[PDB]
Design a protein around this nucleic acid. Structure first.
Ligand SMILES: [Mg+2]
Ligand SMILES: [Zn+2]
Ligand SMILES: [Zn+2]
Lengths: 1333, 99, 71
RNA sequence: ACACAAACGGCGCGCG
DNA sequence: GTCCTATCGATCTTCGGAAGAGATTCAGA
DNA sequence: CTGAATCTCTTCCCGCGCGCCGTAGGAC
């Protein structure tokens, strides 16, 4: 039926009665002797509904015809039993009762309204302390809580000049007493006066709550339960585990307790029991209800004899076991099966093989239809009866049914959308499901026993959906990167690699062949060897400027295997690519380029022929491996013995005392490192070199045909490390602590390890397994967080309208680049026209899709950076615009509108995360940045700037290099000088911080006070003793009072002015500065005399996305002003930053231990590092956020994967960033009813300003806010999604008081209710559905 | 193991589980995301509504297959009703909005 | 068959499936027999073939239904 | 009368 | 033996862990 | 009204296969 939104509200007591169909009186369920439901009890038929079919228990009626009559004997309406599962019943509470969630939400909803702390009101609720009301006639109070004895004595003081109450009754009375609207206005007036922020925030929370509460349809007094609903019995079934011995059903048990607890209280109320007893009873009643809801939020959970905590109502909803995960977001599905996997070489890429047994089952409904279409089956049961036969005709029909029907196969757990793909089936006699080898790799299938699950699409729409998208032929390209995921297997690649290799001399070598046709025949006859060298005539095709393919013929010198393989190659590809040994490297780019040149359709067929050929000649090659293959270098013993002698010298020298233990230790490992590497040199060099061959007389050397070398060299499997261990030495090894054992594993594997050596290796092996075990668990919980926040985003616009964008550069770290700008700009769109080399000429339009050729064209030019539009900059409302996203990785061309990119990005990041772990240099020209420097008496330039950087150009005119040059460091290179490696950049102090006499003159102790501020440290054996400055935080009061500053002087009696300004040049000093160029000594501009003292993967990326402020962040400047100290250091040190215009009186509190890049008179600008250390992203957002923080975050995460060499496309990260700052903060009245200081979702405020400013009305001023993904997701507006994510109760409460209404935007909401999500296909329908609106 | 059709659990109309009982395979939560990654939606709709959680639709689907139509009626996942009842069984009032 | 080409004619993956299904149900139970020849294929493929030719398209389908209503 | 069928919740061990 | 009947809540083998943000809370300023 | 040193209810990959196993107290 039609509906569009979900709304949340608090049920007024009558509303429960409206839902009700009967009061449940008796705390009993069934007639245990003969199991009728208990009338008036937890399963009363007439309250809920008939137990059987359509008929009552007293059998007054026995057909549908009787619909619509009570039976006077046993009441229940003659109706379908299903109604029993639907209708609810109510309970009458003996006394008002408090709902716990509102009480004990982390911000106590009731407490906040009351402005009374959670702990206190609890006393009143539990009848252990009174709360007084209407006591203004006396010393008593509006709502003061008081001790029972305080109350009782107050009773002696006053008869009834007050009222004192306990329990929910008192709470509800207080709520009823609230002049709630005036209270908010009363508080609003207070806010205007409030002079302290800590007070303000507390206040702001309250008013906002009250405003929301009143504006909502909710009224607080309803929160106190008086009538209670009880779930329909069928939803709380009592299955007969063993006949009369039913399985436990907690919810019924809880009801049982409450009902009995309620009844017993009723009795005493009837009897008018003494007050103390009933008071206790009231609490015990509250206790039971409390348990019924949560059963654990109270001090102690209740448990049965089984000693397990009973499952409260909330339990079925909340958490991992909750409905959301248990049922809604994942569910068991009919027409499904699981099987063990196998590889079928004969299969074509689009095909899959499955067993007949499963197939016969899976398509039974289809079979019946065909049988009855055949007319062979008189009825369904007859059809089912025939199928039991498994008769030949059944198989004939099954083949007809399955003739082209697509099917779905998925491994578990899925990594990404490639994890599930569609296939066309073929039938198999066995029981395993057969998979094409090339595809399985993408699935990450390992045949060590992996199982797989199968599902069948039923309807026409699904079948087309499966064939159009999921079918394997469609999915050759990875979506995380527009690169072929289909690159052949280890075996397939190796066979071709062996085939493509050449032999210096071989059978049949040296003939001339007209073409591959005779080449195959000659090899097949055995008259010539596969890799024998040969001359051949060949034809190849070039596609013209438009694509028309024309042929050319030529002769080539080649090995035979290459010619035959060329026959498999389709037209339009140059022969040269195959005229070489083909390892996985060559095949990878060959296939990739082939597809782009020729398209998809030739590619898929081309892949199959490659796959078939590789297996065939891999078998012929007989590429076996044997122990003899592992040749060991004789140098292994020699180097080991040689190295051992040297290590003994180091140990002896330590015994001599000539070296420390640490130096002794680290020198030894270095000796081992050299020894191992020399072994690697000998081992690796020999194996590759191991072939000497005769060619028409005389001998020659060629790359070895050794099995082991071919396997590693081909890239099929292993690495140089593996062979080094096996043939060389297992090498240096470390404890679980990471400390290297001072002796490596000198032994290889070809010869066995010694016991201790092997025992040592166990530490490393287990550690690797240990890390993997927890990592795989930790990474999954990360991905779940990712998907939730990302899911909302969808491309809906074509263009958002922005001309703005971010600028792209190659990462320039560790000197020059470590990535190409070519790869990153690819597939994006410009923000502005590209400036051609030279000036004023534009090379590319302002919004060109930067596909391959233009990127090649750009890099051909001298470009260094380019500006591109971004999804974060995208101005789209409730979504994204296509042009901002640009190319689709899985399609090459621009994206189709209506696609939810967010899930794609999340998955793209998710898979690689598992692979993480949880356990002057060159030629160029010089350039400087953040430059401030002066020239010293030595004729060289020294840096006065506190953030100078060095960068270098390649004399082509493009710049790629960067370094930080310390403050006070002396520049060896000026003028933008040409430079080469070894011409080191500068003279700098990497050990300690200097202080520079920037002016030229005589250094004086003017205003540098002896004893109190500068003190002669003893300096021990030096003989000479040096005056040393002492810090404010350590020196006597005199150190504070007479703060010293290094001041130079000239003929004026004071330093010549700061160049261009009459200010004194005194350099205000920190402590530990040592001065022996004492008063009166000569000094020049820029000279210095001071020397002041200064991981992992998955967790690093994790907290980054959650954007946690680091443990101890760097201290950064803000505002453009000159700094100064005053509020002398006591706890925090205070500094004033004064902009010379507008807002001079800005000052901050700063920790004492941090070193400072400025002291007292330095002019500093916003965001400048006062100290190094991890930056809090929020402040980056605060200072210069949108573009800057994006680049910062993008680089940081990219580094983790760039370290691992994982080619994640950056644009996906931008998607996450979009959500991170989807929120915004307003500080303005503007001209809209947003609170003067308000936090909002950006889109809502953005559009509001669009109309508000279009009206000419003052738009509100806002800043965009940074939320960790976890925090952001929970903050989302569509509560349903957040409710399903985690911390359910804290979410629902949020919706409750708000009475929020959900419009079911996004995917998750639509998924839950099951209607078509706004995905590619569904979006079109949803788009048209709104067209109906 | 394979199942085309079979009984359903009382507390929730979703198919039984496992091999001992003739249960059906669980479409994992993560795998839905993968499906969501592709633009296919009708498949997903059919997945939960027809194949998992709609007595009315799946029965009607059953007949249509015998009728050779291979068409589904949209239906409404039953378990969703269960959740609504439970939430409504709390002190929360929750409703569906027509407009 | 595997298309990877008809999408060019209609220009969108999602529209291709949506439009194709619309046509498919016609030949499934709606009548309006296939326009492309038959090779014991299934209607999903048969309709898919019709668009693969560029023979059938949304605009033609819109024309086809509205003109047919007649009396 | 032309029709249902045997799981609710835990624990241990293994699996990719 | 079969079958009926009313609460259910103390003292015993307990502790077996730990990251991260809203109360309530320690020291004056 | 500032200060940390104090403070507790969220979360802990996806699926699968067996095996066992579930209120107390009493007409004597
Ligand atoms: Mg495996
Ligand atoms: Zn009756
Ligand atoms: Zn845009």
């Amino acid at each position: 039926e039609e509906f569009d939104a979900i709304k949340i509200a608090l049920a007024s007591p009558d509303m429960i009665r409206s839902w009700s169909f009967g009061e449940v009186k008796k705390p009993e369920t069934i007639n245990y002797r003969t199991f009728k439901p208990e009338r008036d009890g937890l399963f009363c038929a007439r309250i809920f509904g008939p137990v059987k079919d359509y008929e009552c228990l007293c059998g007054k009626y026995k057909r549908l015809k009787h619909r619509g009559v009570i039976c006077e004997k046993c009441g229940v309406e003659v109706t379908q039993t299903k109604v029993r599962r639907e209708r609810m019943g109510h309970i009458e509470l003996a006394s008002p009762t408090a709902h716990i969630w509102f009480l004990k939400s982390l911000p106590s909803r009731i407490g906040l309204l009351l402005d009374m702390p959670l702990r206190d009101i609890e006393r009143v609720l539990y009848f252990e302390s009174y709360v007084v009301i209407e006591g203004g006639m006396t010393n008593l109070e509006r709502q003061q809580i008081l001790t029972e004895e305080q109350y009782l004595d107050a009773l002696e003081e006053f008869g009834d000049e007050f009222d004192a109450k306990m329990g929910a009754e008192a709470i509800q009375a207080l709520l009823k007493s609230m002049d709630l609207e005036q209270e908010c206005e009363q508080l609003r007036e207070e806010l205007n006066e409030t002079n302290s922020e800590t007070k303000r925030k507390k206040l702001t929370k309250r008013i906002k709550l009250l405003e929301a509460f009143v504006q909502s349809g909710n009224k607080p007094e309803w929160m106190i339960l008086t009538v209670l609903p009880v779930l329909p019995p069928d939803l709380r079934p009592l299955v007969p585990l063993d006949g009369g011995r039913f399985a436990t059903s907690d919810l019924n048990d809880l009801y049982r307790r409450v009902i009995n607890r309620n009844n017993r209280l009723k009795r005493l109320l009837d009897l008018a029991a003494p007050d103390i007893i009933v008071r206790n009873e009231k609490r015990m009643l509250q206790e039971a209800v409390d348990a019924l809801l949560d059963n654990g939020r109270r001090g102690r959970a209740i448990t049965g004899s089984n000693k397990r905590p009973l499952k409260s109502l909330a339990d079925m909803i909340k958490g991992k076991q909750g409905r959301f995960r248990q049922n809604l977001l994942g569910k068991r599905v009919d027409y499904s099966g699981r099987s063990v996997i196998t590889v079928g070489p004969y299969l074509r890429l689009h095909q899959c093989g499955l067993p007949k047994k499963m197939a016969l089952e899976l398509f039974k409904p289809f079979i019946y239809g065909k049988l009855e279409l055949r007319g062979l089956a008189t009825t369904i049961k007859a059809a089912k009866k025939m199928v039991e036969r498994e008769e030949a005709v059944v198989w004939d029909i099954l083949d007809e049914v399955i003739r082209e029907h697509p099917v779905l196969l998925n491994r578990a757990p899925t990594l990404h959308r490639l994890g599930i793909q569609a296939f066309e089936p073929v039938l198999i006699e066995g029981k395993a499901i057969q998979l094409h080898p090339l595809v399985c790799a993408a699935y990450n299938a390992d045949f060590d026993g992996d199982q797989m699950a199968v599902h069948v699409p039923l309807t026409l729409e699904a079948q087309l959906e499966a064939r159009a998208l999921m079918m394997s032929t469609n999915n050759i390209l990875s979506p995380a990167n527009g690169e072929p995921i289909i690159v052949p297997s280890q075996d397939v690649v190796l066979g071709l690699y062996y085939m493509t290799r050449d032999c210096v001399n071989a059978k049949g070598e040296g003939m001339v062949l007209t073409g591959p046709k005779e080449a195959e025949r000659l090899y097949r006859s055995g008259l010539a060897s596969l890799h024998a060298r040969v001359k051949v005539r060949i034809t190849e095709y070039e596609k013209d400027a438009n694509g028309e393919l024309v042929a050319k013929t030529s002769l080539k010198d080649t090995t035979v295997g290459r010619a035959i393989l060329w026959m498999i190659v389709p037209k339009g590809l140059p022969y040269s690519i195959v005229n070489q040994a083909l390892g996985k490297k060559a095949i990878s780019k060959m296939l990739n380029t082939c597809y782009r040149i020729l398209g998809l359709k030739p590619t898929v067929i081309f892949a199959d022929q490659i796959m078939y050929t590789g297996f065939a000649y891999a078998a012929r090659s007989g590429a076996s491996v044997g122990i003899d293959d592992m040749v060991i270098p004789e140098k292994k013993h020699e180097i080991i013995s040689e190295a051992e002698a040297e290590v003994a010298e180091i140990q002896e020298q330590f015994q001599s005392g000539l070296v420390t233990a640490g130096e002794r230790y680290n020198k030894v490992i270095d000796i081992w490192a050299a020894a191992n590497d020399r072994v690697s040199k000998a081992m690796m060099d020999n194996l590759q070199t191991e072939t000497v061959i005769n060619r028409d007389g005389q001998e020659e050397k060629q790359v070895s045909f050794n099995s082991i070398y071919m396997m590693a060299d081909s890239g099929a499997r292993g690495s140089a490390a593996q062979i080094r261990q096996l043939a060389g030495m297992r090498g240096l090894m470390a404890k679980p602590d990471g400390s290297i054992i001072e002796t490596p594993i000198t032994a290889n594997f070809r010869e066995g390890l010694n016991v201790l050596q092997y025992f040592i290796s166990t530490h490393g092996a287990r550690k690797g397994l240990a890390d993997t075990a927890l990592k795989t668990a930790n990474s999954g919980y990360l991905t779940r967080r990712l998907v939730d926040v990302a899911q909302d985003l969808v491309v809906t616009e074509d263009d958002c309208g922005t001309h703005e964008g971010i600028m792209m550069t190659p990462v320039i770290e560790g000197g020059d680049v470590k990535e190409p700008l070519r790869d990153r700009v690819l597939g994006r769109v410009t923000a502005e026209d590209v400036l051609k080399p030279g000036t004023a000429d534009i090379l590319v339009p302002r919004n060109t899709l930067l596909h391959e050729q233009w990127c090649d064209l750009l890099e051909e030019n001298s470009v260094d950076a380019v500006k591109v539009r971004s999804v974060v900059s995208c101005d789209t409302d409730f979504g994204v615009c296509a042009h901002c996203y640009g190319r689709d990785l899985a399609r090459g061309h621009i994206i189709n509108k209506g696609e939810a990119i967010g899930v794609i990005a999340a998955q793209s990041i998710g898979e690689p995360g598992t692979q993480l772990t949880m356990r002057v240099k060159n030629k160029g020209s010089i350039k400087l940045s953040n430059v401030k420097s002066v020239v010293n008496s030595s004729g060289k330039l020294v840096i006065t700037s506190r953030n100078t950087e060095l960068k270098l150009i390649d004399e082509f005119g493009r710049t790629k290099e960067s370094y930080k040059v310390p403050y006070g460091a002396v520049l060896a290179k000026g003028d933008g000088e040409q430079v080469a490696g070894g011409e080191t950049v500068a003279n700098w102090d990497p050990h300690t911080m200097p202080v520079i006499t920037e002016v030229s003159g005589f250094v004086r102790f003017t205003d540098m006070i002896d004893g109190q501020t500068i003190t002669r440290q003893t300096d021990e054996l030096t003989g000479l003793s040096s005056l040393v400055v002492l810090d404010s935080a350590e020196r006597t009061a005199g150190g504070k009072d007479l703060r010293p500053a290094l001041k130079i002087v000239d003929a004026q009696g004071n330093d010549v002015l700061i160049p261009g300004t009459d200010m004194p040049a005194q350099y205000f000093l920190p402590g530990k500065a040592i001065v022996q160029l004492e008063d009166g000594v000569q000094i020049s501009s820029g000279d210095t005399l001071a020397r002041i003292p200064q991981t992992g993967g998955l967790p690093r990326v994790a907290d980054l996305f959650e954007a946690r402020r680091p443990k101890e962040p760097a201290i950064l400047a803000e505002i453009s002003g000159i700094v100064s100290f005053g509020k002398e250091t006591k706890g925090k040190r205070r500094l004033v930053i004064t902009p010379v215009d507008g807002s001079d009186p800005y000052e901050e509190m700063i920790p004492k231990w941090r070193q400072l890049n400025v002291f007292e008179g330095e002019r500093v600008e916003r965001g400048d590092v006062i100290s190094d250390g991890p930056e809090a992203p929020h402040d980056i957002l605060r200072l210069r956020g949108v573009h800057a923080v994006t680049r910062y975050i993008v680089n940081e995460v990219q580094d983790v994967y760039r370290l691992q060499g994982v080619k994640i496309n950056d644009k996906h990260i931008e998607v996450i960033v979009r959500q991170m700052l989807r929120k915004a903060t307003i500080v303005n009245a503007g001209s809209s009813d947003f609170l003067e200081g308000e936090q909002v979702e950006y889109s809502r405020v953005k559009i509001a300003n669009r109309e508000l400013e279009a009206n000419g009305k003052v738009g509100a001023t806002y800043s965009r806010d940074l939320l960790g993904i976890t925090k952001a997701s929970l903050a989302t507006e569509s509560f349903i999604s957040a409710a399903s994510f985690q911390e359910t109760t804290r979410v629902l409460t949020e919706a409750a008081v708000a009475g929020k209404r959900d419009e079911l935007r996004g995917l998750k909401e639509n998924v839950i209710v099951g209607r078509l999500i706004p995905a590619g296909t569904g979006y079109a329908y949803h788009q048209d559905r709104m067209r109906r609106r | 193991h394979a199942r085309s059709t079979g009984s359903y659990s009382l507390v929730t109309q979703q198919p039984l589980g496992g091999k001992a009982q003739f249960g059906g395979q669980r479409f994992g939560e993560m795998e839905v995301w993968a499906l969501e990654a592709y633009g296919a939606a009708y498949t997903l709709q059919e997945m939960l509504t027809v194949k998992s959680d709609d007595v009315n639709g799946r029965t009607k689907m059953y007949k249509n297959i015998v009728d050779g139509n291979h068409q589904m009626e949209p239906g409404m996942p039953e378990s969703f009703n269960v959740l609504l009842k439970e939430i409504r069984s709390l002190g929360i009032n929750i409703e569906l909005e027509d407009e | 068959v595997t298309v990877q080409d008809a999408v060019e004619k209609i220009g969108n993956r999602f529209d291709l499936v949506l439009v194709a299904a619309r046509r498919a149900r016609q030949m499934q139970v709606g009548g309006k027999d296939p326009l492309v020849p038959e090779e014991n294929d299934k209607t999903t493929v048969i309709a898919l073939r019709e668009i693969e030719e560029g023979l059938i398209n949304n605009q033609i389908l819109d024309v086809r239904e509205r003109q047919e209503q007649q009396e």
